[model samples]
Target chain A: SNAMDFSDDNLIWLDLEMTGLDPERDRIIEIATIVTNSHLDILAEGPAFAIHQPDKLLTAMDNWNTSHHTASGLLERVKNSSVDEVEAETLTLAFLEKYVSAGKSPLCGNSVCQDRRFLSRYMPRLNQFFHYRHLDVTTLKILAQRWAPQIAAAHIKESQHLALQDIRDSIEELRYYRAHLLNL
Target chain B: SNAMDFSDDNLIWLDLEMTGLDPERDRIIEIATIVTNSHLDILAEGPAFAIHQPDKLLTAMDNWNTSHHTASGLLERVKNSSVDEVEAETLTLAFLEKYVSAGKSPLCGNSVCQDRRFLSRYMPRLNQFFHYRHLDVTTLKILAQRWAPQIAAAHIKESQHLALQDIRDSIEELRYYRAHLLNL
Candidate 1:
């Protein structure tokens, strides 16, 4: 397979799980970012950030757990092992600066605009460090389904909404798409 | 083909385009709902409502226009032909009541929870009329790709973010999936 185009810049595959869809009201429960070279080789795995539920957002988070059965495990994981909101944002910034070249990298994820909006609201300065360009794995997956259904079919089952797992699944699909893009 | 389980109840295929993802801050620019029978036959096209951009949320709407190139036409259409926010909500409720039997219908669309949230925020009474369960076309599309790749691939190119077109496409896929589900 020919070397892909993304080899020149770092790919920060980022994902966020939040209490709700509303960035203004909701709180980020978990954040994960996988720093990788252009070749998709793992350079570093996050300073994965999880914040303790805020007093105001606790009910909303509880409701989230109620609606999404799988979210209870996430809530437990976050409550047991997470930092304060300010610390999580600070550590995430420090991690990004250490790994992402020139303090800019393309944010990659599935329907990542929601995550971007949350970051913009919660960590404005850190969010600015990312380039305007985004690589949506959902869009890529749709495209691949059109061009290469067999490849897309293989990875369809792994599309769970967990931030860490979702990012990893997206990266895997992205690599498959890129590898096959050479044939097109 | 034997009609699927949905024949007993109405399938309200709904879609909404909003200022952004967050239901708290963002506002819905347009709403489209297609009332269909269990056999996937259209009963009514909607009381599709578009709202005049709220003054407070204009900047957010402008930013939305900046982010989505395809949305300009929709924004323009809504601005030209839309009702006041209150009337839009009131009319939407009346419209839903007219078609939904037993005060319940299976809401269907791609990523419909977001729309449901916006409706819950703006029109709680109308939102409550819907059954708790939803028929998410995105989930169905993923399943079709996994279990019936040929059917999924044939319609993959029609997927887009536009609200009206999205619901229509979803219905088309839903029909295909239901027809095939009977064969199994």
Candidate 2:
């Protein structure tokens, strides 16, 4: 199924944390989505999932350790909370169907294309439920820097690499841009 | 030939102006390259080309006029200076051969991947002369805004569409980052 046209009424603020940069090879560790209305009032918070595959989890843990030279504590979290891959995919689809209209919502997040890529790989059906269009906080921030410097200046905190927190930050950034600058 | 490992001694700063954004559909209107060493010293300029395809030119001119609500005046420039598509490809290959070692140089430009996509479409062989890695000023600027805010602040002037000027600005921005923030 092809994507539907974006409606201003529905936006799915989504985020994913992954093992590494390459969507083709990397494993998604966490996925979070917040469905919101035009006014940015939250309708539903996700079927947020932490994915657990034994080999992928080990590799992700190893990568984190190698990069930071310290244990990431991700292994414990993944072990305790994450579901198997198929379960995560099923739950995510159900979550989208329940909240999004016409099975399509404009995806919103910081560099949301990266998240979309993982979704396309892991749950191809869910990909059709999103509009091809997106509200990327990174692009919006860059535009804000050009047309509204003060708005850009106010949001200098760097991303913390947690999917839910990142989605929250993206929501706030989008709200500020929509209200003050884009006037959309 | 496949891309080789990047050498500090070689960087090919490239820029392209096209009729529009889509590489598959749009025609490349202008191409420019500046060969520079690690210190950003210019070694050689371009075998720059303005492409002249009569049918594409008319469509481009029409599109430009409609979008800008003013005649772009690109047609006259193209008519006077441009080469045919095949000549543009051959000359660009010859230009790369003259300066870049191992038939590969690290590409540098503001949002150079977009230019690379056009080059790969128009001149596939020319694409092989570039290292897979690229030095994109857009990415560097975003990095600076996060890790090196003062550096990003210093280069707030957005990209102007002109090919040469864009290349020059990219060179300057890359140099500043290399000097102060990213030692590599």
Candidate 3:
């Protein structure tokens, strides 16, 4: 097996913008996924998609949520798509089958827990098939603290409530972790 | 404080072994603290001791407790001490005050939530002290996924069954975390 002999030669990176923190009840307003090969090169990318749940977004945007996420225009975007029209589970599963299948591919994300939590809430058993080990970049930051203390010591800035930017930063972090580990 | 001010000294590593996992019911068994200065030196050491309830340690030769901690002997030691004969609240308050008065130190532990849960039962006001700022060595291990990942793996030989050595090893792990952060 090669150095990166994970389940699949393909790697999936997913990002989500949700209505609120409670994945149990909140809905995903936007989802973006990027599939890559072992060389850290992109193999395919999913178009940015949003399926907003208006009721949850508008009613639950408490002061705490607004201050951190600034989830203001999200409700408007969901209004454009009928909540009843979108099958969240089917769309999610379709995206996974295409990008995160078991054909030697694994899924990646910023804090995969948020995506996992949201996904599991809709398809309770979806986690069983999503066996591709989910890698977290923040953990790399903690790991880097062991070797590259100065770089890891730098305070990380949150991605200004933008899902795509967060995903990009996460990818960069993963690249750094992969390199540092392999080089060492 | 300077940007570099957030070095190892800024981090606080703590551990608490409880009578049981739930703060609502169980109480703290022991509290061990390691305060590292800004230079990452072991500046101070504090250990808040407690004796377990009689019924809990029914078997004098309970190898589980004996092997991990010299608890088999510690039980007898505490039983004979005047401290164990006092009220639980008074003993707990004294232990907490001794540490809280040290400084605004953030807490860290192997299973901090478990410790926090039990401690919270005794000090309901401690709820305000719990927040995201504190470091969790378990979370850090999850992030780093070290070369020997077993070092961070949960339910390992040390953590599976409760004992003082298990917790002491965890504190040693946190020290390694501090050293790692120092290099970072």
Candidate 4:
């Protein structure tokens, strides 16, 4: 037995609802993260954060995000948030620090490029909180979709524009992929 | 054996030397790709590309790159490049399409965020040729560094700034990871 403590090898699954995609032009409106073991077991789900931002910016967002976030109640939560960018970033980083060390956790999700861009631009500290590489499940989903449509069809979709719920769907999707597609 | 053809489950390893980091601001100067088995065996190494660009941008680049790429002789290769931006993108995608169908090959690299961003911004079709999710080995390297110093140091560094050579290094890095750090 190696007797090594690999228990700390957990992934940081993150999802963000942003005003838009451009890191320079848009801002993150809401954010959530969950810690999971290497086996994809849920370890901790941090409090979902609605980041306070200017009403002007929120209203000025493109139609799709406005309609989508509004329907999801994210706009209302963002508008009434007490956690400003600084406070939200501070609190979020503190929460992540509790679970994994800086530059150790891989940000996991369906596709993390946009989420990562916003975090790198606005939430600088929190962005570096994750390693340079990301654990993206959308790749595997696409693989199954292209080659094994049966395995791809086995996954069910039922969630929303909200960050926390979206993240739960991501974790569960990976679980299904591992259990059925990869396991067999 | 399930009689499934997992042989198509190869990865596209890519690396790009760029004018800078910002996808919007920078341009790819050199590009290379290697198709590898799911097991990380090198299937084929495509001809590396050097793209022709305006002399102004290359000269205007920051001092470090000017010197680094100058020393690497990529500057010379780029200046004399027969492949322009459009042609380079076209050629690269055509080469990739021959190996794997669109959206099925996951881009593999040491850190692919920067590479993916540049590809997404400049070479739109080529960017979408691979799936949105990337397979980044830098994540595993970080995990090894944080948890197992022995496994981390077991890797030997040997390579270059050239895209093809850099991709070879990336393939070897992952091979090392799967062989040692993750194999157990």
* lDDT per residue (tens digit) for residues B6-82 in model 3: 33234345565544433444545454455454334454454445445564453443455545444335545444534
Of candidate 1 chain B, the 10-residue stretch with the lowest lDDT total is B175-184
Which parts of model 1 have CA positions greater than 4 angstroms off?
A1-8, A54-56, A59-73, A101-103, A146-148, A159-162, A181-184, B1-184
Query: Which prediction has more favorable lDDT, 3 or 4?
Result: 4
Q: How well is candidate 4 docked (DockQ)?
A: 0.19
Per-candidate Cα lDDT values, in order, are 0.65, 0.64, 0.51, 0.79
- Over the stretch A38-60, how does candidate 3's per-residue lDDT look in tens digits? 55666666555556555645567
- What is the Cα-based lDDT of residue B142 in candidate 2? 42
DockQ values for all predictions? 0.05, 0.05, 0.09, 0.19
Any residue pairs clashing in model 1, and if so which? A7-A38
Taking every candidate in turn, the Cα RMSD to the unseen true structure, in Å, is 8.8, 11.6, 8.1, 6.2
The order by descending TM-score is 4, 3, 1, 2
Model 1 lDDT tens row, A1-184: 6543233367678888888867777878878888777566777777666567754565555654545624436666666665866787778777767666543565666667577768877877767777654555565454344345677787655445567777788777666655553221
Candidate 2 residue runs with Cα over 4 Å from true position: A1-8, A55-57, A60-73, B1-184
TM-score for each prediction? 0.50, 0.50, 0.54, 0.71
The residue-by-residue lDDT of candidate 2 on B1-184, one tens digit each, is: 5444234456788888777765667777777788876567777777766677565444554555434312344455676765876787777767667666644555667656557667766877777677655555564454455345776787667655657767887888766655555422
Best by lDDT: 4
